[PDB]
Amino acid sequence: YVSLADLERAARDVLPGEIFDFLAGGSGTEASLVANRTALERVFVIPRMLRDLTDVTTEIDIFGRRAALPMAVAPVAYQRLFHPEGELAVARAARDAGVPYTICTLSSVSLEEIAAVGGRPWFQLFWLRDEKRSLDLVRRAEDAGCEAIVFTVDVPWMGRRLRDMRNGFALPEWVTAANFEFAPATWESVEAVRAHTDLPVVLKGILAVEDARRAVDAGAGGIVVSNHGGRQLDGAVPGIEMLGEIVAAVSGGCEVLVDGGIRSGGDVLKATALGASAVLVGRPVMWALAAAGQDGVRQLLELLAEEVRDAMGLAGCESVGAARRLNTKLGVV
Amino acid sequence: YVSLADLERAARDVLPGEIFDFLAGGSGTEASLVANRTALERVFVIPRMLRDLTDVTTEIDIFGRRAALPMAVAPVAYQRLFHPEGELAVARAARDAGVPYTICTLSSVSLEEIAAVGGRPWFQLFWLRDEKRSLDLVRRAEDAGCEAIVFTVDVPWMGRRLRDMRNGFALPEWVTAANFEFAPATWESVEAVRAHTDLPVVLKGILAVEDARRAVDAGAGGIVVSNHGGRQLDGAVPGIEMLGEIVAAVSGGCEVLVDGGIRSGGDVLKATALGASAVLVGRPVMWALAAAGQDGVRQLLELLAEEVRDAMGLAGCESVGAARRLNTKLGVV
Amino acid sequence: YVSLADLERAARDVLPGEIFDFLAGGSGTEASLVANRTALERVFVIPRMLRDLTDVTTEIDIFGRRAALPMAVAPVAYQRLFHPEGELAVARAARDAGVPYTICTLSSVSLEEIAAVGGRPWFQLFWLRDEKRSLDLVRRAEDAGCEAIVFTVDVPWMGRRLRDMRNGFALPEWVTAANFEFAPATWESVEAVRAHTDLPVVLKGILAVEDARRAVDAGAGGIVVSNHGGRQLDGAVPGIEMLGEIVAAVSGGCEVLVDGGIRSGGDVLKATALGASAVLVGRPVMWALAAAGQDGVRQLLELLAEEVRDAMGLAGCESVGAARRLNTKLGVV
Amino acid sequence: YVSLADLERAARDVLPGEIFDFLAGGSGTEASLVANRTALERVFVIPRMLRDLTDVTTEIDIFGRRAALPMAVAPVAYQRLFHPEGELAVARAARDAGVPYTICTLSSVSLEEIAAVGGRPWFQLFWLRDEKRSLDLVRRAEDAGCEAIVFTVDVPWMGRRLRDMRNGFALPEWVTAANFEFAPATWESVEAVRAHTDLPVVLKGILAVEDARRAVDAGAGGIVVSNHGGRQLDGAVPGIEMLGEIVAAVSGGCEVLVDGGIRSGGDVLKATALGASAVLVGRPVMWALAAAGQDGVRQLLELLAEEVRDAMGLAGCESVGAARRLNTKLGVV
Numbered sequence A, B, C, D: 001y002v003s004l005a006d007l008e009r010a011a012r013d014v015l016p017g018e019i020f021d022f023l024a025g026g027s028g029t030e031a032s033l034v035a036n037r038t039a040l041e042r043v044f045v046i047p048r049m050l051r052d053l054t055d056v057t058t059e060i061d062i063f064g065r066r067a068a069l070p071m072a073v074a075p076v077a078y079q080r081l082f083h084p085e086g087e088l089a090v091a092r093a094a095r096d097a098g099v100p101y102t103i104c105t106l107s108s109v110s111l112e113e114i115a116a117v118g119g120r121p122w123f124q125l126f127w128l129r130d131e132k133r134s135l136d137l138v139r140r141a142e143d144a145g146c147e148a149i150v151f152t153v154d155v156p157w158m159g160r161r162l163r164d165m166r167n168g169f170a171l172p173e174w175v176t177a178a179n180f181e182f183a184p185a186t187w188e189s190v191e192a193v194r195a196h197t198d199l200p201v202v203l204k205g206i207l208a209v210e211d212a213r214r215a216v217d218a219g220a221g222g223i224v225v226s227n228h229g230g231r232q233l234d235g236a237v238p239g240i241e242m243l244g245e246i247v248a249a250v251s252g253g254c255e256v257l258v259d260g261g262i263r264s265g266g267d268v269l270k271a272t273a274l275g276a277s278a279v280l281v282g283r284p285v286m287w288a289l290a291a292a293g294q295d296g297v298r299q300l301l302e303l304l305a306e307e308v309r310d311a312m313g314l315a316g317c318e319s320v321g322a323a324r325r326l327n328t329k330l331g332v333v
C-alpha cells in the first residue's frame, strides 16, 4: 500500500455492499461528505526551506500523553461489521503505533475489553435518554483507564443516511452494542459530565465559532471541529473550513482537533497549518481493518506516519508546532 | 420515496415527454434554471450544538395563519396536465399537510372549486389586458376565502421556453384556463390591487433590492424573491443569491419568501438561514402529482416535513426563528 | 431557428472542415476563445419589475445614425469563404434589419460594391506597411458613404491559429482581397487617420483601461473592447471582463462597444448592463450566411432582435439606456 | 510541431512507460503538479496596443550574460534516460538557441563534458551528506566555466513519487550519476557556498515570502520560485501563485525566476507580467529530447522563441522589461 486510496479499493472488494455503504455513506445528498474532500483539496501549503531537520519529530503531547503522530483513530461504531476482530484489531494496531484510539459508546466489543489492550485509549460518549446510563458509561470508561471523554454533541439523533435506507441496512445478528435510545445533549449535559470526571472532556462536532468559545468557557479540554464525516446535517460546513476561525477564537484555551476527509500525511499537514492540534481519521482506518485486520491497520498507520514525516520535512518543519506556524493559500481545483 | 429526486424519476416515466419538458424547462439556455440549483449547492450551514430540542416545531405564522412548515406550494399553471385530478389533488394534500396552496390565475380547475377544498389557500394573480378582469379575479378569490393575493410581477409576457418551441407544445384540448391576454403590470397595478382588497398582497418575482424596498413602501405584505424557476429572463440572478441583501434592506417591513430549486428540507434550512420567512416549492410538487396523484403529493409533503424537522434539529434549531439566526458560509462545489 | 446555436450546427454541416475551422478557431490553446464564453456565462442580471413597457424600443443612436438594435455586424474577413454572395448577402440583410455592417479591409467583394448596398455601413481599417494605401482606403471608404472608421489596433500581425496551421489552410483561388502586408499601427497612425477624415474613428481591440483613456484623449469617437474573438493574443482577458472598468474610466467621453462571444439577446443585455453602448457579433453572422445566405442572416437578425426585446422587457427596460442602468452579479457556473 | 503539446505526444510514443512516468509524475496525489497548470490557466494578460514594435527583442541580461529569451532549461536529472546523447544533446541545442542550460548534480554525463559544449551553462547543486563533496562540485563547476550555482533547496530528501513506487522504477544499468546521499541544506550551507565562489548563487525551490527576503539578505543573486514541478511536497502552492508577492517583497534585490508548468510563449508572457525575470522549462525540453534528440530540442526552442516573440508583440511589448509592466487579471476556467 503506497496511499490510503489503495486501501479503499481493497476494502470495497471484500466487504458486502451494504456494509461498504454504511461505512462510505453520508446523509442526504452527501454534499457535506464531498465538501470535506473539496475543502482539503483547495488548501495549499506554503513550505519553508533551509531549516534544521536533524531531529524531525511527529510527536505531540495531548490530554497528558505523548502521541506518536498528531492523529487519533476517530470513533466509528460497530467495528465487527468490518472484520471479526473489530475494535480489538484496531486498538492493538493503534497501541503499537503510539496513536490514541477512541472507544465508542456503540462499540461491538465492550469498552473494558478494548481498554485492556492498553495504549491509553479515549472514550466517546453519546448522551442517552437515561442520563444515569451516560454518567455510568463515563465512570466505566474512567475506571477502565480511558484518558479522555470525547462527548459527541452533533447527534441529537442520527442523520438520514439514504444509502442505508435504500439498502434496508440493519446490523447482522452477530453485531451488537456490547456496552449495553439517544437523547439530545445540552450544555447542561456537558456540565454533568465535567462534574462526574477529572478526565478532559472533548466536545466533538463543533462548527460554530460561538460554540467553540462556549466549549472553552464550559471547561472543555478540547473540541473536534467536525461535521461527523458528512453523516449528520447534510449541508453542514466542513470542519476544515471553520478551523482557522475557531483556532483564533479559542486562542489556546483548549486543544482544537479536526476531522473529515483526512486521507494522507499531506492532509494532516494542511490541518496542522490551519491550526489543528491533531486530526481524527475515520473511514481509512476501517478500510485497512476490512482489508487485512490488525496488520492492515498497522500498515495504514505506518504509511500515515511516513507521509506525515515526509510532508513535515519537505515543508521545513522539525516539529508539529512549527507546522502549525506554516501559512496556507487557497487555490482552485 | 426517500428524497425529492425519487419523485422526479417517477414523474419522467409517466408523463409524455412534451409535458415533462413544459414542467422541467426554463427560458433560453436554461442558465437561470441551472443557477438556482448551483446557488443552493454553494451555501453551507454553520449548525449550532447543545441547544434544547425538547419541542422542535417547524410551524410559522404567516399572513395571519399558522402553517405547518415554512413552505407553500408555488403557483404552477394547468395542473391537469400532470394528473386528471390536477389542482384538486394538490390542494387536498396541501390542506391535509397544513401547507398553504397557491391557486393560479391559469388553473385548470376553477378557483372556487379549489378554494372549496379548504385549507386556507392563496391566490396568484396575473395582470390582464382587461384590468377589470384582474380586479374581478381578486374579488372572486377573496369571496371564495383565499387569504393572500400573490401578484406575479415578472411576467409582462411569457419567457422564451425553447423546449416548448422545439416540441411545438400546446395545451391538450382537455386542459383549459378554467377561471375564464397578459398586460405588463406596473406599480400602479399594485396600488389598484391593494385598494381593492384587505388581503395581504405579496409581490412574486422581485430580485432587485430597490424593488423589494419599494414593495414595502407600496404596502405589500410580502415578496417572493424569485426568477420564476428560470422560466422568465434567462440570465436573471437566482433569488437565493439576492435573498440576504433583500432581507437586510426590508428590515422586517414585510415577509420575504424565496423560491427556485428547493429540493429538500436542507434547502429549506439554507433559505431560512439566509433570512427567508418561508419558501415556495414548484416542480417537486408536480412530480409527486404526476407520479401518484393526491397520495403522491401527501408523501412528498410528509417527506419534506421530516427533512425540515431533521435539518432544523441537527442544526440546533427548535423553531424557524432560530433557523433564521443561523450563519452560513459559501463553499465550492 | 430558435437560438443562435441552431445556426452553428447548420453551418458545420455545410462548410468544408478547414473553412469551419478558420471561422471557429482561436490562437494558441484557444484559452481566450473559451474565456469569452465563460465570462458571459458568469454574469447574471438583476432585472427590475413593474416598469412601464408600453413602448419598448431596442433602438440606439450611434455615430450619428439610428440603429435598430444595440448591435453591429463585426468585421470578418473573406466572407465569400462561407457563401458565394459573401459580403453582399450579409450587408443586404444588415441593411434590411437596420443594423450597421462593418466592411472589412480584407473583404472578398470591394468596399464600393458593398457600400452600394446601402444601409449606412462602417469600414474596418488595417494599417498597412505602405501607409499611403491605408489613408487611401480611408478616403475610399468615406467617398463610398461609410459612416465610421473601425481601426483594428490589435493586429500588428496575425495571431498563431493552430487549426489553420494544422489544416494547412489557404484561401481558395476564387477568394481574394478585393480592395487590393500588415504594419504595426501606433498612436501616430491613429492621429494620421483622425486628421484624414471627419468620420468618427473607433479603435477596435482595446483591453487596457489606460489605452481606453488614451483613445478618448486621441479623439476617438468610440472603442471596441475586444480580444479579437480569441484569435490574437492567446491568454488575453475577455473584453467583457474589462468593460465595466473601461466604461467608468472613459466616463462618457466616447462610445464603448464590446465583442466576443455574444450569442443571444440575453448576452446583449448583459453587455449593456455592464455599460456597453452596443455589441459586435461575428461568428454567428457567418454561421447564418453559411447556412442559408442572405435569408439566413435575415433570420438570425430577426431572432436576435426578438431576443433583445424579450430580455429588455423581462428586465424592466423600455430603452437601451435603462438597460445600461441595470445591475449585475457574478455567479458560478 | 506547432505547440509544446505536440512534443508530449511524440515522447509518450517512444519512451518506455516507466521512464515516461519518471518524467511526467509528481509526488503524492499529484495535486501540486496539476495546480501548476491550473494556476497558469487562470491568469489572463491585459495587453497594450499601439506601441512601437519596430525592434521587438526577447533578450535579457541575467547573471552577467545576455540570453536570447527570458528562459533557461531547468535542471532535470539523468537525461540519458530519454535519449542516448542525454545532456550533451540538450546542452548543444540550448547553446545554439542562446538559452542557458542548467547542468545537474545528478547528470548522466559529467559536468565537465557538458560544460565543454560551450554556451555559458549554469550548475545545479544538491547538498550532500559529505559537505566537502558539495563544495568540490561547486569548484568543479566554476573551474569548468559554469556561470551560476543553482542551489536546489527543496530536496532535503526526494518526495514520494507514487508512479515510480508502483512501477518499481530504478535507473537502467546504463544510466549513472556521472559526477560521482542527500543531506538537508540549511542557511548555513548557503553561506558556505556563497563564501566558496564568486559566481551568483540562485536558490531554487523558494515559495515563502520570508524565505525570498532572507535569500536576498543571504546574498543570493537570484531565486527560483518553484514547487519542483509538483515532485516534492504534494500540496505545495504553485510558484506562479507566490510570484507576484515575492517580486514585491524583494523589490529588485535579486533576480526572481519561476518554473512549473510553462508550456508556451504565452505562459512565459504571463510569468513575466507577474514579475519574473525569466522562467525555467523542464518536462517539455525532455519531451523534445525523447522525440528527436538534439534536433528535437532545437525545434522546441525555436517554437518557444517564436511564441514568446508573438505573445510579446501582440501584448504591445518591445522588450521583456515592458512585459514585466503588463497587468493581469485572474479569470475562471
Ligand SMILES: Cc1cc2c(cc1C)N(C(=O)CC(=O)O)c1c([nH]c(=O)[nH]c1=O)N2C[C@H](O)[C@H](O)[C@H](O)COP(=O)(O)O
Pocket (backbone or CB within 6 Å): A022, A023, A024, A036, A074, A075, A076, A077, A104, A105, A106, A124, A152, A155, A158, A204, A226, A227, A228, A229, A231, A259, A260, A261, A262, A280, A281, A282, A283, A284
Ligand atoms: C464512517 C463512520 C463515522 C462515524 C460512525 C460510523 C461510521 C461508519 N459513527 C456512527 O455511525 C455513529 C452512529 O451510528 O450514530 C460514529 C461516529 N462518530 C462518533 O462520535 N461516534 C460514532 O459512533 N462517526 C464519525 C467519525 O468519528 C468521524 O467524525 C468521521 O469518520 C471523520 O471523517 P472521515 O471518515 O472522513 O475520516
Ligand SMILES: Cc1cc2c(cc1C)N(C(=O)CC(=O)O)c1c([nH]c(=O)[nH]c1=O)N2C[C@H](O)[C@H](O)[C@H](O)COP(=O)(O)O
Pocket (backbone or CB within 6 Å): B022, B023, B024, B036, B074, B075, B076, B077, B104, B105, B106, B124, B152, B155, B158, B204, B226, B227, B228, B229, B231, B259, B260, B261, B262, B280, B281, B282, B283, B284
Ligand atoms: C414549473 C412551473 C412554474 C411556474 C408555472 C408553470 C410551471 C410548469 N407557471 C407558469 O408557467 C406561468 C405561465 O404559464 O406563464 C406559473 C409560475 N408562477 C406563477 O406565478 N404563475 C404561474 O402560472 N411558475 C413559477 C413558480 O411559481 C415557481 O416560481 C417556480 O416553480 C419555483 O421554482 P421550482 O420549480 O424550482 O421549485
Ligand SMILES: Cc1cc2c(cc1C)N(C(=O)CC(=O)O)c1c([nH]c(=O)[nH]c1=O)N2C[C@H](O)[C@H](O)[C@H](O)COP(=O)(O)O
Pocket (backbone or CB within 6 Å): C022, C023, C024, C036, C074, C075, C076, C077, C104, C105, C106, C124, C152, C155, C158, C204, C226, C227, C228, C229, C231, C259, C260, C261, C262, C280, C281, C282, C283, C284
Ligand atoms: C471569426 C472571425 C473574426 C475576425 C476575422 C475573421 C474571422 C473568421 N477577421 C480576421 O480574421 C482578420 C485577419 O484575417 O487578420 C477580422 C476580425 N476583426 C477585424 O477587425 N478584422 C478582420 O478582418 N475578426 C474579429 C471580429 O471582428 C470579432 O472581434 C470577433 O469575431 C468577435 O467575436 P465573436 O466571433 O465571438 O462574435
Ligand SMILES: Cc1cc2c(cc1C)N(C(=O)CC(=O)O)c1c([nH]c(=O)[nH]c1=O)N2C[C@H](O)[C@H](O)[C@H](O)COP(=O)(O)O
Pocket (backbone or CB within 6 Å): D022, D023, D024, D036, D074, D075, D076, D077, D104, D105, D106, D124, D152, D155, D158, D204, D226, D227, D228, D229, D231, D259, D260, D261, D262, D280, D281, D282, D283, D284
Ligand atoms: C521533470 C523533472 C524535474 C526535475 C528532476 C527530474 C525530472 C524528471 N530532477 C530530479 O528528479 C531530482 C531528483 O531526482 O531528486 C531535478 C529537478 N530539479 C532540480 O533542481 N534538480 C533535479 O535533479 N527537477 C525539477 C525541475 O528543475 C523543474 O523545477 C520542474 O521540471 C519545472 O516544472 P516543469 O517540468 O513543469 O517545466
